[PDB]
Ligand binder design. Structure first.
Ligand code: XI7
Ligand code: MN
Ligand code: MN
Lengths: 220, 219, 241
């Protein structure tokens, strides 16, 4: 099976530099052109760079010309992207791709996130959204967690260590003017289970090594 | 500098019906070598894009045969003969005839379902956050369809602007609804200056706009 | 004080070394030219004959260096002959677009090759020739000019091959910079035409002169010595007397 695996993403200050790699397997890498594509958060796809099999022909999107370099190491089945003079507008998921026989994107990697920002890494404050009569509909109560002011982006939220999945809605984060992110996670459960079922939202922020477990209880 | 114009921007479609998505090119995509490098992709929520159709009408190996593409020159069309639940996502066209390779803006395919009015819930700020000097009031619109909805905050019946943010989930894969959060953030001092905190929600599934409110010093 | 015929005597060995190493047709044409110099009654005759052998011999050594076939001027294909034979489906449009520049059809480069589609010669790879020209230019500072046709802003492709031409101009003259500048200016118009026909062509031009260090030429050093020991000395002795 054809597979492309990007690495090298992470957090970069504006003006800084970062080198992405993409490991290719399952096909004769050295016979095929390779590409980088990117997608800024909540936006569309944007082609970045192409490099021919023998590195003879290289193309660049105009927005990265003179800043990014695409290269490859055929004996190592590895595609590179060297990023310099990075700007906030380069924040994106970066995918490497190939046509395995053409200039279309037939195979894509899982992508790697590059965040270009001068905000400092920060774990979230986690606050309960307690169930009440103002969050009860019939035999259903809503509850949740406010996951406030974290950076950079990757945050994962679960409930009761993942046992609770039905009716969970974890909202996409919002980049705040401060440069930090915030989101909430909510879940609707039977009102009969309040007082008998414990509800804990599990908040994992790997870029800061922060893990928070917040018990959400009815407020008295 | 080929510009690819997709239409429609969003396509609600019932399960089992046909969908048709258009992609127009600002110049011809006929290459001098005789091929036309216009291709179609699907990006499911939270996944990387997937190729569906390459060079106008060649279905990529293993792609279900409900997907097909046609067209020539500057006018192209992707058809889904019979829409399934897994087809929820954003469809892109893209061209590789000219450098730079360019994408369309995306067409969001939406699964049609019956109208579902939002359940509206409100959460006052927690005591922990309040101790820290800030107050976030969260308003939740749960499990509604279609996506269009207006949400506004009033504090003591004064409309608020510049201090709230909202977020919307992707269309749910099992029940095809949306959920929406709106967060009003006040300073502690401003919060303890007012009594009634009200979320006003307008949606076509409701007989009239709903105001969900609480009084600060009440439990 | 030396008779021209006697000048050819003193350089017997240098010119016999030269004639033995050149390609056959090249060697013969140079030999005839050499007897024209020996039997030259006027000083303009000798110099003009010497100039032809400078150009013909160098081109012979360019063919040897690159393992290309030396082509006598009389057998060299024109541009129109190349479009006619390599791109016959586009020849009629090639004619219509050359109405206002009919001399394009008759442009005759030093080498008119096509990529092996397996009198236009064929070569294994055009890009390989372009790369080795670009390498020496980048490495030794040798002036080249280089132009590739390109319809609109088209990308190369990996799913189909197209026929393509390599057009190469070479030479041996003092004004190296001026040679490549005028060559690529001559061929620019046809590159632009080729772009509008959807025909892939590369044009290369380069030049050597006698002051280029012997390791840095577009021809093998061994060939540089043969020219400098023969044709170049003959030019010095023609002047002095
Ligand atoms: O000098 C060169 O580099 C030439 O390639 C010259 C050439 O084509 C030519 C053709 C006919 C008569 C004399 C020179
Ligand atoms: Mn010539
Ligand atoms: Mn020449």
């Amino acid at each position: 099976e054809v597979k492309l695996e990007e690495s090298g993403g992470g957090l970069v200050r504006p003006g800084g530099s970062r080198k992405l790699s993409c490991a290719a397997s399952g096909f004769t890498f050295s016979s095929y052109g390779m590409q980088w594509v990117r997608q800024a958060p909540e936006k569309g796809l944007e082609w970045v760079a192409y490099i021919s099999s023998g590195s003879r022909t290289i193309y660049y999107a105009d927005t990265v010309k003179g800043r990014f370099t695409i290269s490859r190491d055929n004996p190592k089945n590895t595609l590179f992207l060297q990023m310099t003079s990075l700007r906030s507008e380069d924040t994106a998921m970066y995918y490497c791709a190939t046509g395995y026989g053409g200039t279309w994107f037939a195979y894509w990697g899982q992508g790697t996130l590059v965040t270009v920002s001068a905000a400092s890494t920060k774990g979230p404050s986690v606050f309960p959204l307690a169930p009440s009569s103002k969050s009860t509909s019939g035999g259903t109560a809503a509850l949740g967690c406010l996951v406030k002011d974290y950076f950079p982006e990757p945050v994962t939220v679960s409930w009761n260590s993942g046992a609770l999945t039905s009716g969970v809605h974890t909202f996409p984060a919002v980049l705040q003017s401060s440069g930090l992110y915030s989101l909430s996670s909510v879940v609707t459960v039977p009102s009969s289970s309040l007082g008998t079922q414990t509800y804990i939202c599990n908040v994992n922020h790997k870029p800061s090594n922060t893990k928070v477990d917040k018990k959400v209880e009815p407020k008295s | 500098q080929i510009v690819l114009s997709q239409s429609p921007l969003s396509l609600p479609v019932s399960l089992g019906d046909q969908a048709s998505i258009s992609c127009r090119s600002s110049q011809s995509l006929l290459h001098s070598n005789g091929n036309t490098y216009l291709h179609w992709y699907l990006q499911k929520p939270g996944q990387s894009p997937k190729l569906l159709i390459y060079k106008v009408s060649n279905r990529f190996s293993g792609v279900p045969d409900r997907f097909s593409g046609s067209g020539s020159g500057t006018d192209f069309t992707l058809k889904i003969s019979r829409v399934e639940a897994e087809d929820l996502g954003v469809y892109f066209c893209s061209q590789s005839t000219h450098v730079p390779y360019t994408f369309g803006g995306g067409t969001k395919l939406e699964i049609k379902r019956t109208v579902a009015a939002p359940s509206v819930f409100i959460f006052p700020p927690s005591d922990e956050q309040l101790k820290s000097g800030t107050a976030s009031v969260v308003c939740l619109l749960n499990n509604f369809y279609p996506r269009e909805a207006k949400v506004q905050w009033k504090v003591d019946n004064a409309l608020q602007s510049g201090n709230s943010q909202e977020s919307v989930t992707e269309q749910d894969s099992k029940d095809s609804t949306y959920s929406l959060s709106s967060t009003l953030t006040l300073s502690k001092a401003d919060y303890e200056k007012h009594k009634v905190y009200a979320c006003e929600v307008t949606h076509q599934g409701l007989s009239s706009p709903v105001t969900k409110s609480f009084n600060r010093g009440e439990c | 004080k030396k008779p021209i015929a006697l000048i050819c005597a003193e350089l017997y060995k240098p010119f016999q070394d030269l004639f033995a190493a050149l390609p056959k047709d090249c060697s013969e044409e140079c030999q005839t030219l050499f007897e024209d110099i020996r039997n030259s009654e006027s000083h303009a005759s000798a110099w003009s004959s010497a100039l032809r052998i400078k150009g013909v011999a160098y081109e012979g050594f360019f063919s040897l260096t690159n393992s290309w076939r030396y082509i006598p001027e009389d057998l060299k294909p024109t541009l129109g002959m190349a479009i006619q034979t390599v791109f016959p489906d586009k020849f009629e449009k090639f004619l219509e677009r050359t109405h206002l520049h009919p001399e394009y059809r008759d442009f005759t480069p030093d080498y008119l090759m096509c990529r092996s589609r397996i009198a236009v010669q064929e070569v294994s790879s055009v890009s390989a020739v372009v790369d080795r020209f670009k390498s020496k230019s980048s490495e030794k500072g040798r002036p080249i000019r280089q132009e590739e046709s390109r319809p609109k802003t088209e990308s190369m492709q990996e799913d189909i091959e197209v026929d393509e031409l390599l057009i190469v101009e070479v030479g041996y003259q003092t004004d190296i910079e001026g040679k490549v500048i005028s060559d690529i200016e001559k061929w620019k118009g046809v590159v632009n035409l080729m772009s509008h026909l959807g025909i892939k062509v590369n044009v290369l031009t380069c030049a050597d002169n006698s002051q280029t260090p012997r390791t840095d030429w577009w021809i093998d050093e061994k060939y540089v010595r043969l020219l400098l020991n023969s044709i170049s000395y003959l030019f010095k002795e023609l002047l002095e007397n």
